């Protein structure tokens, strides 16, 4: 006769991940590589969003 013993599942061998990246990144260069920095009496807060 013929019998159902087990079922094979062909498990995956690797992981693929693909995501979107915006061309503009951030003005950290305008902050860390800035030519001039503010006095400790008038601190420079720049908003990043």
């Amino acid at each position: 006769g013929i019998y159902q013993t087990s079922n094979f599942r062909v498990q995956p061998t690797e992981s693929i991940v693909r995501f979107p990246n915006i061309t503009n990144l951030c003005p950290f260069g305008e902050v860390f590589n800035a030519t001039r920095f503010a006095s400790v009496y008038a601190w420079n807060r720049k908003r990043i969003s």
Partner: nanobody
Amino acid sequence: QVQLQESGGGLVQAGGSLRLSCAASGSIFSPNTMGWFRQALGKQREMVAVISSIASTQYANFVKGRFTITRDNTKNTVHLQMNSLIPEDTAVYYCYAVDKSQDYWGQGTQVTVSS
């Protein structure tokens, strides 16, 4: 890039008169406050005078009744009529834009008075 143009100093005999000028460029948002400061070689920044957008003028006791600040609203510039000169006024002066964000300084104007 906020820039302050300072001009009008030099060598003047005792009793003469000069007219310094700072023009402000860049952002310089409307509620601004600008002063002039003094520094002689070996001393600190001495607050000479200050003017705000309110048109009020504040002067120190060092130069009582001698130096004046004049405002130009059209170009938003300032001129300091510096008269009745005395050797104790021998110091390089600098510009101070309070504004609302960081305060930008000038490059300097040499003022010498001696005989």
